[PDB]
Amino acid sequence: LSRNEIIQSYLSRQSSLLSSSARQLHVLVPQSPPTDLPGLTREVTQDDLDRIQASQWPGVNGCQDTQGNWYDWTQCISLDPHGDDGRLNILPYVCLD
Amino acid sequence: GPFYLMRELPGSTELTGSTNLITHYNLEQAYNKFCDLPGMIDLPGSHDLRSLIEKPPILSSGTMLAGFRLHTGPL
Amino acid sequence: HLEEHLEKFVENIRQLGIIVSDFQPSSQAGLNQKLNFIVTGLQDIDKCRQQLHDITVPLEVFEYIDQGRNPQLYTKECLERALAKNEQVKGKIDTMKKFKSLLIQELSKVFPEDMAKYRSIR
Amino acid sequence: MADRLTQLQDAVNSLADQFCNAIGVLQQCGPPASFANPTEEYAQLFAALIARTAKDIDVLIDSLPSEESTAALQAASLYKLEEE
Amino acid sequence: RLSTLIEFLLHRAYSELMVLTDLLPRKSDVERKIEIVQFASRTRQLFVRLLALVKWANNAGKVEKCAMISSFLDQQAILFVDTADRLASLARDALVH
Structure with missing residues (x-):
């Protein structure tokens, strides 16, 4: 608190950057006016459950991406939001077992 | 549109520490003058223990009768 | 005065x-003690005139007088410390100015539209 | 642990920590005045780090799930999965 | 405050002179002249240091303004450190819980 020195300030730098971290970002997702219980109110049907099981749904069953690669919830996404060599690594959302 | 909890910033240049405080406080000419009074007073007198006692009293803070009772001889 | x-x-x-x-004065030298x-x-x-005048003086004047210098040196040192504090404070505010400028530059690089709307609102 | 959510929490806390560290560095240490270069380098590095943290937080926010998949869509899928 | 010091200096001078005049007939006169000139040196030093004081009495108000300036700038420095301190107390105490 009282004093910050070159070595200690650089320690702060590497610790903060290792905690935190041509585009390769996720494809943007717009707002969603049809939501299933409140918004659109679909009576329980069947197309929605078959889409949530088998197909690709980019807001529900995974995160899509530029360069095309699909990632569902149990996988870890490697990206690079900056123009550097440092890569963001989004951890899995679920982490089964 | 507007960000959450925007507000009004203060008056553009009020009193800061980035101004020249001395020139605003009319003290410039004294500094431009300034940038011993023992010696400047020894311009008047001879030179400048019990004077340590003078400074210690500084750090601490019947005339006709005296002339009549001041009897002492010459030699 | x-x-x-x-x-x-x-x-x-x-x-x-x-x-x-200090001299061996045969004549009246009691006039000196009377004066x-x-x-x-x-x-x-x-x-009584100092009760009329009412001067207030700090102690470091007395102490520099004890050192036998001018108190003008104490005036010089108070002026110098005033300029030292003003220099330090203006420097800290100047580094904050440069840091704000750098931050808005880099955020305008990484977030275009948001810093555009911020520069609009100011 | 090991979720995108805990990553986002740690990124937001790192943003607040970089705020306090940036002010405490750039007010405590500076060249005096005139009516240093290491301090200028420190300012550039701190600004870059804050910008990078902001970009990472934005990317993680984009990554989590949408406001589709409400809880009833989870519950009905859970029901169908119990039957199968 | 200089009025009180002036009065006290005049009082101590007159009292020491009264003690000297009391011992004046008592002391051996030849060495009493030496003691008189020593006391005269004492009084001259007291009065010349008072003369330095009343010389500096013109320069008193500028030092008062300098004290005002120094207090103000110290206050703004404490404002900077207090802002950084409250941000640290935000970032390490309230958000962790």
Whole structure:
């Protein structure tokens, strides 16, 4: 608190950057006016459950991406939001077992 | 549109520490003058223990009768 | 003001008295002691005048006088410390200015539309 | 642990920590004045780090799930999965 | 405050002179002249240091303004450190819980 020195300030730098971290970002997702219980109110049907099981749904069953690669919830996404060599690594959302 | 909890910033240049405080406080000419009074007073007198006692009293803070009772001889 | 000249005449009379009593004066040298007592009386009148004047002085003036310098040096040092504090504070505010400019540059690089709307709103 | 959510929490806390560290560095240490270069380098590095943290937080926010998949869509899928 | 010091200096001077005049007939006159000139040196030093004081009495108000300036700038420095301190107390105490 009282004093910050070159070595200690650089320690702060590497610790903060290792905690935190041509585009390769996720494809943007717009707002969603049809939501299933409140918004659109679909009576329980069947197309929605078959889409949530088998197909690709980019807001529900995974995160899509530029360069095309699909990632569902149990996988870890490697990206690079900056123009550097440092890569963001989004951890899995679920982490089964 | 507007960000959450925007507000009004203060008056553009009020009193800061980035101004020249001395020139605003009319003290410039004294500094431009300034940038011993023992010696400047020894311009008047001879030179400048019990004077340590003078400074210690500084750090601490019947005339006709005296002339009549001041009897002492010459030699 | 007048207390200065009065005490100065008192000090000069004290010096002349020390010179005369330093000499073996056969004539009356009690006039020196009488002038010293009258100077003490005039200093009491000057103390009434100092009740009129009401001067307030810090102690470091007394202490630098004990060191035998000018108190003008104390004035110089107070002025120098005032400029030292003003220099330090202006420097800290200047580094904050440069840091704000750098931050808005880099955020305008990484977030275009948001910093555009911020520069609009200011 | 090991979720995108805990990553986002740690990124937001790192943003607040970089705020306090940036002010405490750039007010405590500076060249005096005139009516240093290491401090200028420190300012550039701190600004870059804050910008990078902001970009990472934005990317993680984009990554989590949408406001589709409400809880009833989870519950009905859970029911169908119990039957199968 | 200089009025009180002036009065006290005049009082101590007159009292020491009264003690000297009391011992004046008592002391051996030849060495009593030496003691008189020593006391005269004492009084001259007291009065010349008072003369330095009443010289500096013109320069008193500028030092008062300098004290005002120094207090103000110290206050703004404490404002900077207090802002950084409250941000640290935000970032390490309230958000962790």
